[PDB]
Design a protein around this ligand. Structure first.
Ligand SMILES: Cc1cc2c(cc1C)N(C[C@H](O)[C@H](O)[C@H](O)COP(=O)(O)O)c1[nH]c(=O)[nH]c(=O)c1N2
Length: 344
């Protein structure tokens, strides 16, 4: 049956209710960037080296000083219990099995503590939204610290929610039994009520003082903003267009990655998300200077198939595709994945 990530999406469409599948699938507005996040990867071509000896391929690397089994991590996707009863608990259990990290959404259908308890040995980070209520925001950070999370990914591209047309048509909301467990389109209205449109670099200063945990700015698309993040003492940049769900018509993340890598001058790690579906996508992102990539939608499709097992299957497929791509490219380990491997 399911042998690549595209197969998992197709299966998910057949088993999920339309409103739930559309919530997960959709981009903003006409979905121009959604298509481009995938198409852009295909424009970057590979220039493999032969006869390098790839008998022993080592996929391991590090994210903010913590070892991972591969440069492929789970990105924050809200409300995972819509896809499978076990939701974020299934996800964290799979990450623990694989030896990779899970970024937990602030809008999760499972708590910061429920997830630490299900995956005590897993590498775990918290994705933070800055709520109008700074006390709520502090509590989330403090819980992350107490429960053994290793970094804060602060999302900086969402002063308001993007306009996803299917969610408006469907009047999207949670199924009746579910809740965000740490507290038109229903989600757009929620954001308007809860999330602060005023946040500025001064609020990053506040956050930097609040915690000693590593902080990564998630959603940066400009080199000038990346340099400002470095100036504020942040510890990484996640080059992201929010899975094409915020401003439509921004570039693909693979296309802006080189500008951002250049701008930070090696001072902090740079990551990527948006459109990663294949092992060659991962290879391309590393050749252009990313330390690791995050996957969003593929994880939700794993859940929709078979919960924990379906997430593990998706991560295993990406791991094996990546291993093969490295080997066929002449790369024994991630340290030798260089810029001459790709051209646009
Ligand atoms: C259904 C769904 C739900 C969320 C997201 C995305 C999607 C598709 N994303 C953005 C996410 O972290 C990531 O940037 C993208 O999913 C990456 O793109 P791909 O889905 O892998 O193409 C997201 N980001 C975030 O900071 N907080 C959140 O709660 C969510 N929730």
């Amino acid at each position: 049956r399911l042998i690549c990530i595209n197969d998992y999406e197709q299966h998910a469409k057949s088993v999920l209710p339309k409103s739930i599948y559309d919530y997960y699938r959709s981009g903003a507005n006409d979905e121009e960037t959604l298509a481009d996040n995938i198409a852009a990867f295909s424009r970057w071509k590979l220039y493999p080296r032969m006869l390098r000896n790839v008998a022993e391929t080592d996929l391991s690397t590090s994210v903010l000083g913590q070892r991972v089994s591969m440069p492929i991590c789970v990105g924050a996707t809200a409300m995972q219990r819509m896809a499978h009863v076990d939701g974020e608990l299934a996800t964290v259990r799979a990450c623990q099995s694989l030896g990779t990290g899970m970024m937990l959404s602030s809008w999760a259908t499972s708590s910061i503590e429920e997830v630490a308890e299900a995956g005590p040995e897993a590498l775990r980070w918290l994705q933070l939204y800055i709520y109008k209520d700074r006390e709520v925001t502090k509590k989330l950070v403090r819980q992350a610290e107490k429960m053994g999370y290793k970094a804060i990914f602060v999302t900086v591209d969402t002063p308001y929610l993007g306009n996803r047309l299917d969610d408006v048509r469907n009047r999207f909301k949670l199924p009746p039994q579910l809740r965000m467990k740490n507290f038109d389109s229903g989600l757009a209205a929620y954001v308007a009520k809860a999330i602060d449109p005023s946040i500025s670099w001064e609020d990053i200063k506040w956050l930097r003082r609040l915690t000693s945990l590593p902080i990564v700015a998630k959603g940066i698309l400009r080199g000038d903003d990346a340099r400002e993040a470095v100036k504020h003492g942040l510890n990484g940049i996640l080059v992201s267009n929010h899975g094409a769900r915020q401003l439509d018509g921004v570039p693909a993340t693979i296309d802006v990655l080189p500008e951002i890598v250049e701008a930070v001058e090696g001072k902090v790690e740079v990551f990527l998300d948006g459109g990663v579906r294949k092992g060659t996508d991962v290879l391309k992102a590393l050749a252009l200077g990313a330390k690791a990539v995050f996957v969003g939608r593929p994880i939700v499709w794993g859940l929709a198939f078979q919960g924990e097992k379906g997430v593990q299957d998706v991560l295993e497929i990406l791991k094996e595709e990546f291993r093969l791509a490295m080997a066929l490219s002449g790369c024994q380990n991630v340290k030798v994945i260089d810029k001459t491997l790709v051209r646009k």
